[PDB]
């Protein structure tokens, strides 16, 4: 045949892949963590958005740290050979490097390690996307590498709080779903996420009766170890 290029991930496998949404709203009283009002709006928006991208969506609600680890282990041991990609969305409390189960924390590295190129062979060479709505602190504003082909779409910069509106959902997830709905059939994923960065940074500002938390801004951040362009469509 003619000249062939290979700069984009193959996204025409029989299945787009799994989209696992972990939606933690209510936390065990002994942890002292507040309920995350608005997170159901986020989870419903994500389910619809990724359904329209033809992902097989699984929604999980209020998982303990042990259930989160078992879920991720089990999913990583499925046969993904017919799937183009893998998506995991985490909606919870967090700190830098940490997501909360309902009864305590989970290292993000523990979750993502299950999908390393050497530990999930049916996803080797395929994009693994982790979308994280959670705080990252308390500031206010041997052929391929085993860490290759991961993308972390973080709601907020390292060290910073992340903002959630109790009526409308989180700023980041609202914006992410809007930009995927508008541009997934047109733009490469990094360009979509750049538009999410701009939407969050320009269209949102906190309102609080507490001067410490009032009039604050947010910038998300994209951490890419991808090796190819990612388009959700194919020719």
């Amino acid at each position: 045949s003619g000249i062939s290029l290979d700069n984009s991930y193959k996204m025409d496998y029989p299945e787009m892949g799994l989209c696992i949404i972990i939606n933690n709203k209510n936390f065990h009283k002994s942890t002292g963590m507040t309920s995350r009002s608005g997170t159901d709006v986020d989870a419903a928006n994500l389910r619809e958005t990724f359904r329209n991208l033809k992902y097989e969506v699984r929604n999980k609600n209020d998982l303990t740290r042990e259930e989160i680890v078992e879920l991720m282990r089990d999913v990583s041991k499925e046969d993904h050979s017919k799937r183009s990609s893998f998506v995991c969305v985490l909606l919870s409390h967090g700190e830098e490097g940490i997501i909360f189960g309902t009864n305590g924390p989970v290292d993000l590295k523990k979750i993502t390690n299950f999908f390393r190129g050497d530990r999930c062979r049916s996803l080797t060479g395929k994009p693994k996307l982790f979308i994280i709505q959670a705080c990252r602190g308390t500031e206010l504003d041997h052929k391929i590498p085993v860490e290759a082909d991961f993308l972390y779409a973080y709601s907020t910069a390292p060290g910073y709080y992340s903002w959630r509106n109790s009526k409308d959902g989180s700023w980041f997830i609202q914006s992410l779903c809007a930009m995927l709905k508008q541009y997934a059939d047109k733009l490469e994923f990094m360009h979509i996420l750049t538009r999410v960065n701009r939407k969050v940074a320009t269209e949102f500002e906190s309102f609080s009766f507490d001067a410490t938390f009032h009039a604050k801004k947010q910038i998300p951040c994209i951490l890419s170890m991808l090796t190819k362009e990612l388009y959700f469509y194919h020719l």
């Binding site: 995350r36 919870s92 709080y161 992340s162 903002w163 959630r164 109790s166 309102f207 938390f213």
Partner: peptide, 4 residues
């Protein structure tokens, strides 16, 4: 508006 709330923080996570």
């Amino acid at each position: 508006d709330e923080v996570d």
